[PDB]
RNA sequence: UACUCGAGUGGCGAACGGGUGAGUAACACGUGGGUGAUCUGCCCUGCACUUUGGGAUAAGCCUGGGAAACUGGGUCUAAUACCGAAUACACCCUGCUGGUCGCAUGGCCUGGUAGGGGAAAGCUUUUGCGGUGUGGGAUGGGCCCGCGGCCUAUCAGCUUGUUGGUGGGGUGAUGGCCUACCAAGGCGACGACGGGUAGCCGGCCUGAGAGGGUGACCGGCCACACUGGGACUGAGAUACGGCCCAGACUCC
């Protein structure tokens, strides 16, 4: 009774990652950009709808995004402190 | 240092730590030997020096002085260095 | 800790007979003491207090016992008054008294406490023993040959045994089958007032 | 180094024991991965209950049960089932069924009448 | 004689177990994921094996300080202790060369090809344990992320490795993590930087409910060992009965 030298493991499916879409408001830096993300929640006590915005640091390699443009974004592994967001594709420009 | 067990463990720790320091000194000597070889910019001397360095690092990983992944990454660094320069 | 003082004094003070064989109560129905004839202002608090005192001191139960009886009845899915009266009647002392083997609650309680009876073939001595539906109560020979027990069993001409209770033979075996209903218990006094007060 | 442990639950005068698979560095009463069986010393039947499938799976994946757990495995039949030498035999003794209250009442009523 | 074993070399255990809440307004905790960027003795299960040569020392003996712990000098000894060489192409690197995926680099197909290198210890004769490199389990872990959870403008601007990028170093790991060169920025009234309080959660109390207080025991994490710094060990370190240094106290 001789067994094979290779024993394949279980193919763990690759997991999903958070995806978001927002607007770029400044690109003065090099291959980095600002995108604002908007969220809506109900106040736990009063129930009011409250609008909030976030500032996130995205990753780029060519600086193809102009000011005041809608863009799609994605999650990546870390590259710089407080910079943990990545570009996928641009959607709207003006 | 209160009971025989820990005093003996102490003794052994200092002894084999002297041994550890000797070996680490040897590895660090190989490392900076490669460093100044690269700084000077030798090619065949660097070739045999890095052969010896890789041998020493592999043996250190084998006897547990350094992590085998650490040795592999160090060797890859040497290769990248010699190919860029 | 049982009650040692007089049993007639509570009946005299609260204005209604308890044992039923109390000659002094009918002799002097007015409240005892030096000024029992004086008028007393009527009040709901007074009324509720009299009802609860009547119940607790007539059944000889202890105060915390009655309190968690009430809490259990309230937690019971059924109506609180019915649950309370049923669990209160479930006490073994009252069970034997209504079975007719006992002439007084005090003596019945002492007999149960000393444990002259057998429960499912095992001797149990607890005056506040819980008795549930479809149970069996036996009698020991040391009780059968006991003189007062013989007197009770040969002179059991008291009020008729209730529906849920019934004796089968000379051994004085007591059985319970179904859950008493307030109407067929027909206990004196009322329970709505007591439950209201304990809700207060 | 997962080993099956007995967790002390219950009461002092009659201890109650569960059968648990957990790491050797966890507590006697703390972290657990699964609950698989139990032990009752007070009842002279000595009631034994265990999940055969889970026990077999753990023995296969490589648990190292202690001496008392191994003894319980022999008693139930799991250890010898795994080893395959004698086979599968059940040495456990079930608690004596309690005679029905209804038939006790019927017999008592018949005796009375 | 090894049945037995003082002390001494040599393995394993010794970060387990057990206590506490000063420090923290923080990924620290729960919650749900990512790790194509990660490691992992002792267990189980497979693959190929497990050659050779040598020096040294404790111990023991002689001896000096000295009540003391401990310590200097001379002689001397074995091991699975230490060190060369025998291969290894399932391992790690560099140059050339195909298919899929997208998560962007690039990953995977153990893709293919040229060159380089990578180690072992025996005892026992009994329900046997060990030594090297590689594939898979299970636990053990490491980094990161969206949401949540005190008061306070009688605290209005803060920061210079601070922000973004290029070459090197580094660790196991991606990374201003560090260094050298470039650009001047990032966060800010949707409350930064400041000041006061406090370990967190499953729970407990109260309350129909929303809501309010609280963290007893038990259960899961975070941090600490007179105070403040530093480093080696190891697969694993805030290393509470491990080590070096600075201060207060106590004892011979
Ligand atoms: Mg960088
Ligand atoms: Mg130096
Ligand atoms: Mg060698
Ligand atoms: Mg038992
Ligand atoms: Mg010895
Ligand atoms: Mg051993
Ligand atoms: Mg610890
Ligand atoms: Mg350890
Ligand atoms: Mg603890
Ligand atoms: Mg305390
Ligand atoms: Mg505190
Ligand atoms: Mg401190
Ligand atoms: Mg603060
Ligand atoms: Mg967390
Ligand atoms: Mg946490
Ligand atoms: Mg010596
Ligand atoms: Mg020798
Ligand atoms: Mg060796
Ligand atoms: Mg391949
Ligand atoms: Mg090679
Ligand atoms: Mg070789
Ligand atoms: Mg060898
Ligand atoms: Mg394997
Ligand atoms: Mg593995
Ligand atoms: Mg995890
Ligand atoms: Mg997160
Ligand atoms: Mg939160
Ligand atoms: Mg900075
Ligand atoms: Mg600078
Ligand atoms: Mg590095
Ligand atoms: Mg930098
Ligand atoms: Mg409640
Ligand atoms: Mg609440
Ligand atoms: Mg609180
Ligand atoms: Mg607490
Ligand atoms: Mg706790
Ligand atoms: Mg400390
Ligand atoms: Mg102190
Ligand atoms: Mg301190
Ligand atoms: Mg280490
Ligand atoms: Mg370890
Ligand atoms: Mg320790």
PDB file of N, CA and C (backbone and C1' of nucleotides) and ligand atoms in Angstrom, chain E residues 224-228, ligand 39:
ATOM      1  P     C E 224       2.304  44.956  29.389  1.00  0.00           P
ATOM      2  O5'   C E 224       2.076  45.071  30.962  1.00  0.00           O
ATOM      3  C5'   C E 224       2.538  46.200  31.692  1.00  0.00           C
ATOM      4  C4'   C E 224       2.493  45.945  33.178  1.00  0.00           C
ATOM      5  C3'   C E 224       3.324  44.768  33.669  1.00  0.00           C
ATOM      6  O3'   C E 224       4.675  45.136  33.895  1.00  0.00           O
ATOM      7  C1'   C E 224       1.139  44.659  34.601  1.00  0.00           C
ATOM      8  P     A E 225       5.836  44.027  33.954  1.00  0.00           P
ATOM      9  O5'   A E 225       6.075  43.797  35.511  1.00  0.00           O
ATOM     10  C5'   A E 225       6.144  44.894  36.417  1.00  0.00           C
ATOM     11  C4'   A E 225       5.741  44.473  37.806  1.00  0.00           C
ATOM     12  C3'   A E 225       6.754  43.586  38.521  1.00  0.00           C
ATOM     13  O3'   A E 225       6.698  43.808  39.931  1.00  0.00           O
ATOM     14  C1'   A E 225       4.750  42.372  38.170  1.00  0.00           C
ATOM     15  P     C E 226       8.001  43.556  40.840  1.00  0.00           P
ATOM     16  O5'   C E 226       8.204  44.929  41.625  1.00  0.00           O
ATOM     17  C5'   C E 226       7.243  45.381  42.567  1.00  0.00           C
ATOM     18  C4'   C E 226       7.485  46.816  42.966  1.00  0.00           C
ATOM     19  C3'   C E 226       7.709  47.794  41.824  1.00  0.00           C
ATOM     20  O3'   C E 226       6.501  48.230  41.228  1.00  0.00           O
ATOM     21  C1'   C E 226       9.359  48.129  43.483  1.00  0.00           C
ATOM     22  P     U E 227       6.409  48.423  39.637  1.00  0.00           P
ATOM     23  O5'   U E 227       7.206  49.774  39.368  1.00  0.00           O
ATOM     24  C5'   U E 227       6.691  51.020  39.811  1.00  0.00           C
ATOM     25  C4'   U E 227       7.629  52.155  39.487  1.00  0.00           C
ATOM     26  C3'   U E 227       8.136  52.214  38.055  1.00  0.00           C
ATOM     27  O3'   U E 227       7.209  52.785  37.152  1.00  0.00           O
ATOM     28  C1'   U E 227       9.950  52.483  39.531  1.00  0.00           C
ATOM     29  P     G E 228       7.186  52.301  35.620  1.00  0.00           P
ATOM     30  O5'   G E 228       8.589  52.786  35.042  1.00  0.00           O
ATOM     31  C5'   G E 228       8.877  54.168  34.911  1.00  0.00           C
ATOM     32  C4'   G E 228      10.257  54.405  34.349  1.00  0.00           C
ATOM     33  C3'   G E 228      10.601  53.667  33.066  1.00  0.00           C
ATOM     34  O3'   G E 228      10.058  54.282  31.911  1.00  0.00           O
ATOM     35  C1'   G E 228      12.412  53.519  34.587  1.00  0.00           C
TER      36        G E 228
HETATM   37 MG1  LIG F  39       6.497  50.563  37.730  1.00  0.00          MG
END
